[PDB]
Amino acid sequence: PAWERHLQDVTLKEGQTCTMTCQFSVPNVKSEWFRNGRVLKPQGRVKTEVEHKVHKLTIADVRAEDQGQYTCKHEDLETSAELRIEAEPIQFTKRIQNIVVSEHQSATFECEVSFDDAIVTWYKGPTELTESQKYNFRNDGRCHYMTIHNVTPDDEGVYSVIARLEPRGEARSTAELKGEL
């Protein structure tokens, strides 16, 4: 009975899944996991696992709120390390892109972001777009949408999107619309 590999230190940032690991001298024997000295209960955002000799914790999409000491135990024998994670700028994993659409039709702007509890807001030049029989919005968790109904000569111009949460580098991207003849 001994840890053959201690818990490893992990540097990351918000908006990423984190797995943290160690290894015991005995196959599949379950460990007691802890964080900030508290019992690390597997509950949706937090998970823990055991293998044929390794032991695991996974935080599905880390928050800066999840940083600190993590610990893994087996009766008398324990190991511990730190998770270090900054507030990154909330940014796009796909980014919005330019569109060419014929005037009778619709134009579907689309993007996707780093982190699961994100909010989105849509724009044309300085003006924010409200849902007004012309600009239609949807979310699919990490993914965001703006459908524009009709693409007139006036509907051309710079559009933008804002990805936003708490005040962590609120990222912004643009895309120009074009009318097809």
Swiss-Prot record:
Residue ranges occupied by any Ig-like domain in the UniProt entry: 1-84, 89-177
Highest taxon of the lineage: Eukaryota
Mod. after translation: Autophosphorylated.
Disulphide bridges: C22-C72
TPR repeats: 30-63
Compartment(s): Cytoplasm; Nucleus
Similarity comment text for this entry: Belongs to the protein kinase superfamily. CAMK Ser/Thr protein kinase family.
Subunit structure: Interacts with MYOM1, MYOM2, tropomyosin and myosin. Interacts with actin, primarily via the PEVK domains and with MYPN. Interacts with FHL2, NEB, CRYAB, LMNA/lamin-A and LMNB/lamin-B. Interacts with TCAP/telethonin and/or ANK1 isoform Mu17/ank1.5, via the first two N-terminal immunoglobulin domains. Interacts with TRIM63, TRIM55, ANKRD1, ANKRD2, ANKRD23, and CAPN3 through several Ig domains. Interacts with NBR1 through the protein kinase domain. Interacts with CMYA5.
Record's function text: Key component in the assembly and functioning of vertebrate striated muscles. By providing connections at the level of individual microfilaments, it contributes to the fine balance of forces between the two halves of the sarcomere. The size and extensibility of the cross-links are the main determinants of sarcomere extensibility properties of muscle. In non-muscle cells, seems to play a role in chromosome condensation and chromosome segregation during mitosis. Might link the lamina network to chromatin or nuclear actin, or both during interphase.
Domain free text: ZIS1 and ZIS5 regions contain multiple SPXR consensus sites for ERK- and CDK-like protein kinases as well as multiple SP motifs. ZIS1 could adopt a closed conformation which would block the TCAP-binding site. The PEVK region may serve as an entropic spring of a chain of structural folds and may also be an interaction site to other myofilament proteins to form interfilament connectivity in the sarcomere.
Entry protein name: Titin
Provenance organism: Mus musculus (Mouse)
Gene: Ttn
Range of the intact protein held here: 9633 to 9809 of 35213
